[PDB]
Amino acid sequence: NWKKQCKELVNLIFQCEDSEPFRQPVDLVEYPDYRDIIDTPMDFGTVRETLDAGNYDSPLEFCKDIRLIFSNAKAYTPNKRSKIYSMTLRLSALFEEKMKKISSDFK
């Protein structure tokens, strides 16, 4: 059951300290130029909601949206000295480790 596996992984991510800036959509009052840089916003709350609505056709679609969270974060704050950049690298690494098993069990 890939859907329950992906749900467990999203719940795991919400418990990770590094996910805090990615739990909700980026706020456009706080970051007014965000959408001049980012075409397709994404966050873990949205991913959770999409999964619960049954609106991912496969784990690859789920993964693509999670990868988008990280690519967006790195695009908007590209300075590798920044806290957010390091939090993105660490959380990305954990996610990819976990997603590997889900993707195998599927294929």
Residue numbers in the entry: 1317 to 1423
Publication passage describing the model:
Bromodomains (BRDs) are protein interaction modules that specifically recognize ε-N-lysine acetylation motifs, a key event in the reading process of epigenetic marks. The 61 BRDs in the human genome cluster into eight families based on structure/sequence similarity. Despite large sequence variations, all BRD modules share a conserved fold that comprises a left-handed bundle of four α helices (αZ, αA, αB, αC), linked by loop regions of variable length (ZA and BC loops), which line the Kac binding site and determine binding specificity.
The WDR9(2) interaction with H3K14ac showed strong dependence on S10 and T11 phosphorylation as well as acetylation at K18.
